[PDB]
Write a protein that binds this ligand. Structure first.
Ligand SMILES: CN1CCC[C@H]1COc1nccc(-c2noc([C@@]3(C)CCCc4sc(N)c(C#N)c43)n2)n1
Ligand SMILES: Nc1nc2c(ncn2[C@@H]2O[C@H](COP(=O)(O)OP(=O)(O)O)[C@@H](O)[C@H]2O)c(=O)[nH]1
Ligand SMILES: [Mg+2]
Length: 168
């Protein structure tokens, strides 16, 4: 049977979670997508010759630490922690998202990838070295992406699938 992978995209508002997810689903750059819409989207993909079913949850809205929201996030098997390379605050928030994932999954080894988005822009404020060194502190991969140009989009999602496969 075809394996389904439940992936969750997290990070500050405005980093490009929706743009990244829609590039994967539609193969098109969407510069405008209602910042309040949180929803899930499926796509069949060939990753290393195997057709698998991705189920991507694109998160949005206010932080809520209810038993219901924890249960909803606990459905994720792997997480993309996204920041924007021209927004220092989004990068400085990443540790919070990682700590919340570790708590809900009750595990120090949850499949995760650090994503530096907006790599097409010239306004960089977060050095690639600092981002690579944060992923090294966590023991996870780092991928540079652009939802505008498609840079790194399959690398981010497919690497997360490969981290889930090794975790099982
Ligand atoms: C002063 N703040 C703290 C630093 C940044 C600043 C603002 O932080 C901020 N803003 C919005 C959302 C979040 C946020 N953190 O984790 C989560 C998720 C979705 C991640 C996945 C695992 C869980 S489990 C659960 N219940 C969640 C929820 N709501 C989550 N989202 N953080
Ligand atoms: N140049 C550029 N802008 C992007 C990129 N990804 C998203 N954006 C823009 O960043 C803003 C926020 O994007 P959105 O996908 O709504 O972020 P979300 O709140 O994390 O879902 C919008 O103005 C998008 O056009 C990218 O890689 N490059
Ligand atoms: Mg969004």
């Amino acid at each position: 049977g075809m394996t389904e992978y439940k992936l969750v995209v997290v990070g500050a508002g405005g980093v490009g979670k929706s743009a990244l997810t829609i590039q994967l689903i539609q193969n098109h750059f969407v510069d405008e997508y209602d910042p309040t819409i949180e929803d899930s989207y499926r796509k069949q993909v060939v990753i290393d010759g195997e057709t698998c079913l991705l189920d991507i949850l694109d998160t949005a809205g206010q932080e809520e630490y209810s038993a219901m929201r924890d249960q909803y996030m606990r459905t994720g098997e792997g997480f993309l922690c996204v920041f924007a390379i021209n927004n220092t605050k989004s990068f400085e928030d990443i540790h919070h998202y990682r700590e919340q994932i570790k708590r809900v999954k009750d595990s120090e080894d949850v499949p995760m990838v650090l994503v530096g988005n907006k790599s097409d822009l010239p306004s960089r404020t977060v050095d690639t070295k600092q981002a690579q060194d944060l992923a090294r502190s966590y023991g996870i991969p780092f991928i540079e992406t652009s939802a505008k140009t498609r840079q790194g989009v399959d690398d981010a999602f497919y690497t997360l699938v490969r981290e889930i496969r090794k975790h099982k």
